[PDB]
Design a binder for this molecule. Structure first.
Ligand SMILES: *[C@@H]1O[C@H](CO)[C@@H](O[C@@H]2O[C@H](CO)[C@@H](O[C@@H]3O[C@H](CO[C@H]4O[C@H](CO)[C@@H](O)[C@H](O[C@H]5O[C@H](CO)[C@@H](O)[C@H](O)[C@@H]5O[C@H]5O[C@H](CO)[C@@H](O)[C@H](O)[C@@H]5O)[C@@H]4O)[C@@H](O)[C@H](O[C@H]4O[C@H](CO)[C@@H](O)[C@H](O)[C@@H]4O[C@H]4O[C@H](CO)[C@@H](O)[C@H](O)[C@@H]4O)[C@@H]3O)[C@H](O)[C@H]2NC(C)=O)[C@H](O)[C@H]1NC(C)=O
Ligand SMILES: O=C(Cc1ccc(Cl)c(Cl)c1)N1CCc2ncnc(Cc3ccc(F)cc3)c2C1
Ligand SMILES: [Ca+2]
Ligand SMILES: [Ca+2]
Ligand code: NA
Ligand code: NA
Ligand SMILES: [Zn+2]
Length: 807
């Protein structure tokens, strides 16, 4: 119930939301059908449109008008945005030359530069260049301010997850808005674009910027706008709020445009009909900036122009139907479109089996345009699993395609409406969106590399003097965007110090069931091999210092000629193995006599070692090595690679991947990058939360043993950004690529896996590309502790994702 017979007189776009049944006058009242009876008359005035003209200049104030051209409008804060231009001979903001804003130039009583977020729905990154001729205000923001060539959204690349990620700094799995449509089985409730369940606060987790601000004494404009409030009125409302007295005036504001997404769905991302909505958005930016100029705030406010996601060409004819794969299609519920999520239609159906659904969807058609996954097997870079609102079965849809349950769903929702959609994998080029920052706190005429939208919350907090709530950004990684207000983090403190074991065990103390043909025997070289075991080559193989262990554990540093490792006494294998391969390095084979060689490590007790007999008896599990024997520096150094302390558990199907990486790809990268440093290791994430598992969370061991089975294997591959310098003698910035490969007992993910590894392994690794920060979370390790570089620069490096998309 609403008693809509209250009034909006003096309450138009009030900031505090009043409680039912009392009627409302705020920017969401329309969405709730709760506005007071006189809201349209008083708060949505339209008379005479949005622009002054010469004949209105100095008019007598008429309070029916949408905006004002009368002499008193400036002091009232309600002039049309073109008032000074039409009536006082001033220029539009866009026609003024760019001049660096070295310091805020703010009116008396401003405590801090305000922040205005200008968010555009469906604004694909390439519109900045492709539409630049019809967007002159946006182009001035972009060229005069700080911009990225693009900004990466989160997955799924849908509106609500991405706008709420912008506001929170959180992955969708953590904030809880995991799609535009959702079912929460604990609540037994559904969230939809249409309707009323989406208003309940239990959907919306984390802490959005407006709450963060309010909690710390900073006032916030409301970030949401009911669809029927015209854009011109949204802008005039912001400008009116900016004229409030100092004690009442918000410091942070957002504008939201439904364009160009709305037209992009109908016309495609580059439809000829797209020119007009891009023009109209630019006009709106112009209104804002002209309005700020009238208030003398154009060199005071920080403005962020940001999109939520891009837009791809998608049509009804590019739809895959689950009815063409599954016999039992009426036993499932599908969340359809540009991603798929499947669950049982009835929780009472005990014949529902996800294994059989996954199998019926795997590599069935030669050009199949989606791939099924248990959510825990999705690329870790997506961070899309750890929420009960994410169904166990996920379909990753190829760009340009849709998935649906049955054909009747697509023509009874038989011709086609739409030409554009989004939601795909967030590394897809067409899903990338925009970022521009303009203002005193941003840099002048500065291009920055692409970054992820999860990082902006921290920066917006920095722009407002707020302490961010706990989030998934890496605070400091965007310091290079800012003139001032940088956040200067310290490196985390190492929690566990390593042991440095010497030779403490005799060979005969080991009963590991291992054998090695190594009984093959000099004082020149004897001292020399001892030196290697004490760390004499470590400067070459450990280039950025040893990783810091950020949790409590027992581990040993093991040195060798060709590699260094941090060996866990708890997990019976390395946490990390580091080695450098020069451009000139040669690949060799595993000699015949060493094919099955595993050697006891006399620095590590039998009790903290793996054993070969476990692998013999586990018919499912084999082993591999972290430092690859193929890249040994000499026949004698090769023996080190067969130490039991370099061994890790590997399914034979995974060994195909791993061996190709080690034998072929590492050397290829060293040739292309002028040497690489590699750090490899295991990851255990059995509860798919993106964070390192403790010992008691491990669900699988090598049969009969205490040797835990990794869920994934990582590698971090670092070289010199200036590739004329070798990786091991680099004076300047670094370049990195990394992966987190799922450790799976089949290659069902790769439909072409019966072919030679040269046709499928590298494609797999690109899909599972990762940020160093992703690996940090998953291992509790902190990398790049000892470089010549600034810590902020290193944080940027750690957040880099190598995407393997072209321009
Ligand atoms: C990205 O950044 C975020 C934010 O930093 C990281 O997420 C944090 O991760 C922490 C560890 O996983 C987690 O800490 C836990 O907090 C519990 C209290 O949580 C509530 O309060 C906080 C603070 O206000 C609030 O933010 C939480 O909000 C979540 O839950 C509500 C639903 O009620 C949602 O609205 C909201 O969207 C959010 O959901 C997300 O997080 C939860 C997990 O909290 C997931 O289940 C969801 O799927 C979703 O992803 C909460 O309202 C606290 O109780 C936990 O403590 C347990 O574990 C510790 C281990 O040290 C143990 O010592 C304790 O005993 C305790 O265990 C007991 O409970 C167990 C389970 O019932 C039981 O098994 C035991 O036997 C014990 O009885 C824990 O400390 C923190 O909440 C989240 N924060 C958020 C906002 O998500 C995230 O990790 C980052 N991601 C990456 C990849 O780095
Ligand atoms: O205003 C809207 C349309 C809208 C209208 C009425 C209702 Cl009843 C609802 Cl629910 C939505 N929307 C779109 C969805 C959305 N999802 C999450 N956050 C926001 C706010 C926001 C704005 C800018 C920004 F950079 C970050 C966040 C937004 C903003
Ligand atoms: Ca959107
Ligand atoms: Ca985990
Ligand atoms: Na075996
Ligand atoms: Na396969
Ligand atoms: Zn859309």
């Amino acid at each position: 119930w609403t008693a809509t017979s209250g009034s909006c007189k003096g309450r138009c776009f009030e900031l505090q939301e009043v409680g039912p049944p009392d009627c409302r006058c705020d920017n969401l009242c329309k969405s709730y059908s709760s506005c007071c009876h006189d809201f349209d008359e008083l708060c949505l005035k339209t008379a005479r449109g949005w622009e002054c003209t010469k004949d209105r200049c100095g008019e007598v104030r008429n309070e029916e008008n949408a905006c004002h051209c009368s002499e008193d409008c400036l002091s009232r804060g309600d002039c049309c945005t073109n008032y000074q231009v039409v009536c006082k001979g001033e220029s539009h903001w866009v026609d003024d030359d760019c001049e660096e804003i070295k310091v805020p130039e703010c009116p008396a009583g401003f405590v801090r530069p305000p922040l205005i977020i200008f968010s555009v729905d469906g604004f694909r990154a390439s519109y900045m260049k492709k539409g630049s001729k019809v967007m002159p205000n946006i182009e001035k923001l972009r060229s005069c301010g700080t911009h990225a060539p693009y900004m990466r959204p989160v997955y799924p690349t849908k509106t609500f997850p991405n706008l709420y990620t912008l506001a929170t700094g959180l992955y969708p799995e953590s904030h809880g808005i995991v799609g535009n449509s959702m079912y929460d089985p604990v609540f037994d409730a559904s969230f939809h674009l249409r309707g009323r369940e989406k208003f309940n606060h239990r959907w919306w987790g984390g802490q959005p910027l407006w709450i963060t601000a309010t909690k710390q004494g900073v006032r916030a404009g409301t970030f949401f706008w009911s669809v029927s409030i015209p854009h011109e009125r949204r802008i005039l409302t912001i400008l009116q709020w900016l004229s409030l007295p100092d004690n009442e005036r918000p410091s942070v504001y957002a504008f939201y445009s439904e364009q160009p997404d709305f037209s992009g769905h109908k016309y495609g991302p580059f439809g000829p009909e797209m020119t007009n909505p891009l023009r109209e958005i630019d006009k709106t930016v112009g209104q804002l900036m002209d309005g700020l100029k009238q208030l003398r705030l154009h060199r005071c406010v920080n403005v962020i122009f940001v999109g939520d996601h891009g837009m791809e060409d998608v049509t009804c004819d590019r739809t895959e139907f689950l009815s063409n794969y599954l016999t039992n299609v009426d036993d499932i519920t599908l969340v359809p479109g540009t991603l798929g999520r499947i669950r049982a239609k009835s929780i009472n159906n005990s014949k529902y089996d996800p294994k059989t659904i996954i199998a019926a969807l795997t590599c069935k058609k030669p050009d199949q345009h989606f791939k099924p996954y248990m959510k825990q097997h999705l690329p870790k870079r997506l961070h899309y699993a750890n929420n009960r609102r994410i169904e166990d079965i996920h379909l990753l849809v190829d760009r340009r395609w849709h998935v649906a349950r049955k054909p009747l769903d697509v023509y009874k929702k038989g011709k086609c409406f739409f030409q554009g959609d989004h939601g795909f994998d967030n590394k897809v080029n067409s899903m990338q969106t925009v970022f521009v920052g303009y203002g005193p706190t941003f840099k002048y005429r500065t291009k920055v590399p692409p970054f992820e939208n999860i990082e902006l919350y921290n920066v917006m907090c920095d722009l407002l003097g707020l302490k961010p709530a706990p989030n998934n950004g890496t605070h400091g990684s965007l310091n290079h965007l800012l003139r001032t207000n940088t956040f200067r983090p310290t490196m985390p403190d190492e929690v566990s110090r390593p042991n440095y074991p010497g030779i403490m065990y005799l060979q005969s103390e080991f009963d590991l069931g291992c054998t090695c043909d190594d009984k093959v025997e000099n004082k020149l070289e004897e001292l020399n091999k001892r030196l290697h075991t004490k760390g004499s080559t470590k400067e070459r193989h450990l280039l950025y210092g040893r990783p810091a262990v950020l949790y409590r554990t027992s581990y040993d540093i093991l040195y060798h000629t060709d590699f260094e490792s941090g060996y866990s006494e708890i997990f019976l294998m390395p946490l990390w193995t580091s080695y450098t391969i020069s451009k000139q390095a040669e690949v060799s084979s595993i000699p015949e006599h060493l094919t099955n060689c595993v050697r006891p490590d006399v620095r590590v007790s039998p009790g903290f070692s793996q054993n070969c007999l476990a692998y013999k008896n586990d018919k499912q599990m084999s082993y591999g090595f972290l430092f690859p024997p193929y890249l040994s520096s000499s026949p004698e150094a090769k023996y080190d690679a067969f130490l039991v302390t370099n061994m890790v558990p590997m399914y034979p199907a995974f060994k195909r991947v791993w061996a190709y990486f080690q034998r072929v790809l590492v050397k290829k990268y060293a040739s292309e990058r002028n040497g690489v440093n590699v750090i490899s290791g295991p990851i255990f994430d059995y509860n798919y939360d993106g964070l390192r598992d403790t010992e008691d969370e491990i669900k699988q061991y090598v049969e009969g043993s205490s040797i835990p089975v990794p869920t994934h294997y990582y590698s971090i591959i670092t070289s010199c950004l200036d590739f004329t310098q070798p990786a091991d003698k680099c004076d300047g910035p670094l370049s990195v690529s990394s992966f987190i490969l799922p450790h799976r007992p089949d290659n069902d993910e790769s439909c072409n896996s019966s072919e030679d590894e040269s046709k499928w392994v590298e494609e797999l690794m690109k899909m599972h590309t990762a940020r160093v920060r992703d690996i940090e979370h998953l291992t509790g390790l902190d990398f790049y502790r000892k470089t010549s570089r600034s810590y902020s620069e290193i944080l940027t490096l750690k957040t880099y994702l190598h995407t393997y998309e072209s321009e």
